[PDB]
Design a binder for this molecule. Structure first.
Ligand SMILES: NS(=O)(=O)c1ccc2oc(=S)[nH]c2c1
Ligand SMILES: NS(=O)(=O)c1ccc2oc(=S)[nH]c2c1
Ligand SMILES: [Zn+2]
Length: 258
């Protein structure tokens, strides 16, 4: 894999190695709030993160992932548009070089400074690798980040970034509670989509929260000090690791609220 976010290997180039990039249910997308329809049949989302077991944080060259123990139902997402139980496996963010860009999904074309993706897989498929091969294999909870007041629950992440500056570095990250990354409201929009990075598999039920969380300028500034490169290689700041909105095609975005 040589894909990335540069001019020579960015989103415009991905289709040559991952043809599904021009598929029928690609993500992210722009959420047109006026066109999204309230669906009375949608259920309240059920986010059960009390028993979450975080293990490690890794810089994988495109973002940093906080990984969880998913060998048991410890942190799960259920309800909403989902049927079944989805286990949290990892979370990561996409962000910009400037506060005015960074999110993958947009709301009425508005771009947020960053976007958090809490990734969950459908337990009926047994493991994550099998789940990504299914249309309903994953449920990703997307949360927008706007720059304003600091998010207390995010500080432990910000403070460990110095230890995983470059690609391939990891650090112990146990006892991190992801509940501190959520906004107050769980109102959301939902639609069928895909992974936003290669392999771009069309296996995701996207659940995007309406309420952004606020993070401080200093917190996001630290995200921008990370590197896409490995140690001992020319420094390339890890910024603008977001894919732009893709064609909605034959899909409807549904709202859980009126
Ligand atoms: N993965 S990809 O985005 O299609 C892509 C784009 C440009 C590339 O140049 C080399 S060399 N490998 C590459 C892979
Ligand atoms: N950016 S994202 O769509 O949330 C996402 C989530 C899980 C993933 O697993 C692989 S592999 N690529 C992924 C992209
Ligand atoms: Zn993501």
């Amino acid at each position: 894999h040589h894909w990335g976010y540069g001019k020579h290997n960015g989103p415009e180039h991905w289709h040559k190695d991952f043809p599904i990039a021009k598929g029928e249910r690609q993500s992210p997308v722009d959420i047109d709030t006026h066109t999204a329809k309230y669906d009375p049949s949608l259920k309240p989302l059920s986010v059960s993160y009390d028993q979450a077991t975080s293990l490690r944080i890794l810089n994988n060259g495109h973002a940093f992932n906080v990984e969880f123990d998913d060998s048991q139902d410890k942190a799960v997402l259920k309800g909403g548009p989902l049927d079944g139980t989805y286990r949290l496996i990892q979370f990561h963010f996409h962000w910009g070089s400037l506060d005015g860009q960074g999110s993958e999904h947009t709301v009425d074309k508005k771009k947020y400074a960053a976007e958090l993706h809490l990734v969950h897989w459908n337990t009926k498929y047994g493991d994550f690798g099998k789940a990504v091969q299914q249309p309903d294999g994953l449920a990703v909870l997307g949360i927008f980040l706007k720059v304003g007041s600091a998010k207390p629950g995010l500080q432990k992440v910000v403070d460990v970034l110095d230890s995983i500056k470059t690609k391939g570095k990891s650090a112990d990250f146990t006892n991190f509670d992801p509940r501190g990354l959520l906004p107050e409201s769980l109102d959301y929009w939902t639609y069928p989509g895909s992974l936003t990075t290669p392999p771009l598999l069309e296996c995701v039920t996207w659940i995007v929260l309406k309420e952004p969380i606020s993070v401080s300028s200093e917190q996001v500034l630290k995200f921008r000090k990370l590197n896409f490169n490995g140690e001992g290689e020319p420094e390339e700041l890890m910024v603008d690791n977001w894919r732009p909105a893709q064609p909605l095609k034959n899909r409807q975005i549904k709202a859980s609220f009126k």
